Design an enzyme around this catalytic site. Structure first.
Site, PDB file in Angstrom:
ATOM      1  CD  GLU A  11      -3.043  -0.978   0.179  1.00  0.00           C
ATOM      2  OE1 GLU A  11      -3.088   0.072  -0.458  1.00  0.00           O
ATOM      3  OE2 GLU A  11      -3.915  -1.847   0.024  1.00  0.00           O
ATOM      4  CG  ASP A  20      -7.854   4.030  -4.363  1.00  0.00           C
ATOM      5  OD1 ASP A  20      -8.379   4.407  -5.436  1.00  0.00           O
ATOM      6  OD2 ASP A  20      -8.497   3.370  -3.557  1.00  0.00           O
TER       7      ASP A  20
END
Ligand SMILES: [Cl-]
Ligand SMILES: [Cl-]
Length: 162
Positions: A11, A20
């Site tokens: 991540e 994202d």
């Protein structure tokens, strides 16, 4: 290696609101703020989550406290889900980490839709599960991350992460 170090590799860490892979406002270690297109909505979700006026920036300690809660929440979601829990209980400690990674990324409802893969994982048919896990929007949108997670379920080792 452990679930924390695994998700931190997958991540990243960003201390300012970012979008994202799907285009959604996110902060910290993959902490999704909102699916709404509004950056004002994101900031307000961020303020609520941290408990102060952030103006879209958080400290490292704050990103790690969100991370901790999110990992905890993903575990608790597996354990309360009738379809996920039996699979998780059946797995060893490394592949448990893979199941958590998936739930963290796509939510308990999303992972619970991998009905066929879950059955193969439960039966310990590793090569078959891995082939079925890859036939997914998940694998096609985020192939490098999905390959590391699939390798983990297939081998039961941390090799894809070293
Ligand atoms: Cl929160
Ligand atoms: Cl990826």
């Amino acid at each position: 290696m452990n679930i924390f170090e695994m998700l931190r590799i997958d991540e990243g860490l960003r201390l300012k609101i970012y979008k994202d892979t799907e285009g959604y406002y996110t902060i910290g270690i993959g902490h999704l703020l909102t699916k709404s297109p509004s950056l004002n909505a994101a900031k307000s979700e961020l303020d609520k989550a941290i408990g102060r006026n952030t103006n879209g920036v958080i400290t490292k300690d704050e990103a790690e406290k969100l991370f901790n809660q999110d990992v905890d929440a993903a575990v608790r979601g597996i354990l309360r889900n009738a379809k996920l829990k039996p699979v998780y209980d059946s797995l060893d400690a490394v592949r448990r980490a893979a199941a958590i990674n998936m739930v963290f990324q796509m939510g308990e409802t999303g992972v619970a839709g991998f009905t066929n893969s879950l059955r193969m994982l439960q039966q310990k048919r590793w090569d078959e599960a891995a082939v079925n896990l890859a036939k997914s929007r998940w694998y096609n949108q985020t192939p490098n991350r999905a390959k590391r997670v699939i390798t983990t379920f297939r081998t039961g080792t941390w090799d894809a992460y070293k």
